[PDB]
Amino acid sequence: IAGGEAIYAAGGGRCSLGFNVRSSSGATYALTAGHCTEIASTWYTNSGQTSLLGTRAGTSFPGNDYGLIRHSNASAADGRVYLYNGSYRDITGAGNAYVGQTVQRSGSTTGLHSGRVTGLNATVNYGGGDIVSGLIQTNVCAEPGDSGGALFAGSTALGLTSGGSGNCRTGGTTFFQPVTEALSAYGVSIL
Template sequence: MSGKFLPTARFLLIVSLLSSALAVTPSAGAQAEPALQTHDVPVAGGPSGEAAQRLADRLGRSHTAGIYLDRTEHRFVITATDERTAEAVENAGAIPRRVTYDTAYLDSIKKRLDTNFKTPGTMWGIDVLANRVVVRADSTVGKKDFAALKKFLAPYGSAARVIRVGGKTERTSSAINGGDYIENGVVSCSYGFTVRKKTDPTYKAILTAGHCTITSGTDWRKSDGTYIGYTTGHNFSNGNDFGLIRAYNSSVTYYGNVEAEGGTAQDISYSRDSRLYETVCASGYKSKYACNSVGLKNQTINYTDGSQVTGMDVAFICRDHGDSGGPLFAGDAALGLLSGSNNSACYSYYQPVNEALAWYGMEVF
């Protein structure tokens, strides 16, 4: 995953650790440091994540190539393709990092991949730290398909690369796993976030994965068999993976929280987009609670069953069958819903939650 550019020593260490994760599966229960709160407040004297992103947007896609969190400095890094942009970043209190390729160019490569390939077992998108588009091909991708991707990207030189990863890229729903789950008689998945309509707070629902709610079963129950509601929406097309279950049992209390460490409850009060390299946590009925970092954003995932999702966040958290729809969060912030994973490589793929909330006119609470 390392590129030709020279990040800080801390990030060289991160890259080394991530490369090792491709060969050795980390423990799903491994705990990381508590998530940084990066909304609305400055980080170690620098701009907040939102402010850093706004600055990068103002500087323009042809002058920057993404932002990420330097967890040693607790400040945001904004990449810059020229000295003038780097000076603007430094003057704003963020850390500038010079890179060769800008977002507009790298995104054009990703879009060409999206248009020309749907190779099962692959994932691709911009790797901000490496400053290139990286295609990750799992163990199911044959030599012919791997060579085709490599040939396609060859004209882009160091701006694009194809690498091998272990394991299989799979959706994580399951019809057989038991435990603390939600099921509709066809699949068992994980409860994501409790949400409510912005225009009618008394209307409550449950967000989960769209490939769970698109199945033929419409009535959902929790682990003890109690009815919790019925499918009222699903979006598993055009690269999305989110669905909605109407909370429809007055005898059930639909709390606005998620399961955290040791079975404790973490209250969720708002939603936001994840930040690259921040610490995040996940819950699911099969793999339970675990934390690690967001390693990639806006990735295209091609599952081994032939389905494709786009715009996914990738967290380095091991997930398994049955965890689909489970929440990704940081403190009291809702971030995403689990779509699938490559459990051997400890990649888990998350649908950003704000897109789902906007689609249904909902909010977390």
Template sequence: RVAVTEKSSASVVSTLASGKTAVEAVLVERGMDELRKMSDALAKRITKANKGARQGLQSAVVTEKNVLRLDVPRGRKLTDEQRSVVRWAERKFGDALVVDSYRHASRPVYCGGQYSCDPPLRSGLAIYGGNTRCTSAFMAYDSYGYYMMTAGHCTEAASYWEVPTYSYGYQGVGSTADYHFGHYGDYAIVRISDTAFWQPRGWVYTTQPIRSWGYDYVGQYVCKQGSTTGYTCGQITDVNATVHYPGRTLTGMTWSTACVAPGDSGSGVYDGSTAHGILSGGPNSGCGMIHEPISRALSSLGVSLLAG
């Protein structure tokens, strides 16, 4: 399906595609450039309104519905500035805006005398498998156990993982439980084989706890903590992007301007206490970051984030 904003364009699309593939031209009211400009304007106001708030507003372009979505935290009281942003957006965008709510909070887990056992955002911790070094992202769980999240392409070179410790050299973490690296994403989970792994042992990681996960939108500010380049941040420039790797094409990815380098793969991408993705890669030169949206990774793997 190809979206067009003018009826005259529909016949052009059909003519160009004739005899090659089945293409349906769909007439929409707003083009992608217009939606992105709307998203940028809203993102600037959201960023300002969310500062100091316990729960943030978030937004995204919904291409299949040709609208901009603004999500408010379900069951949470908004600040005066956040309410002002919602009212402004409703007046400014009219029927081009859909206001919805989100409730993606992760669950605290009690174990061994402490909650969460370790900060669930452990991005920045180098993980080793064979000759491969990547970075850990968020911690997750399901009814079968606890997991460390990382990039799917890391697991193609190794299945068993170790982490460095200051006192013990290297300690085993566990084996890859599930992963995907291909057209629909780049994500993996490593099953924690030893519950002692959860206890802090001086490993380097940020202490920022993760409370929930959210969707990406153009103009949003995101950060990552990698085992190569450390803490870097940037703004999202493209969502639902198609990325061409050597021998692989990935769809539905997110681009931002943060700087990354080899070894950062698998880092958790986040904004404050909200998880947004798993670092997948970057450009051949210069700064830039590609990440797998956390919503798709969690859904595909069937796991939930641990809360800090």
């Protein structure tokens, strides 16, 4: 499974995989949104929930928005992002974002969209105390289901879709969790 592809929670809920990562010991995981991993411990790669992805290994949500899923099969840990046209992009490292940067977002609801970083230090309020801060603001649209997907530029991983406003029909604004903070938190590296 590659970055951008759908992940399904046991008993309902869909998100997108961000990036596949590995610990210094060679254990592999999938990064996604923390608001996603908070809903279930077991994840699947198909809607019918018969192909197991793995089980939740960590969650950092409200505050940040990142989470980790341990792969049940190391071979499913594809170090690429799916481009939705039958092609894949190999991700070679992680980097920082900057205002004016041109970016691409891969998600399971709306496919691949591009845009620009328009702001930093952004905050989103999901209600019920769910405030996420330190986010990258962009003009890339996204829809529910895209959450946890990959934000990248070229071969460089940048962030994970948290959420935003608008849709891909009218345009919107999306907020992303910088990936490097996540890699740091878990001592993981891009595959």
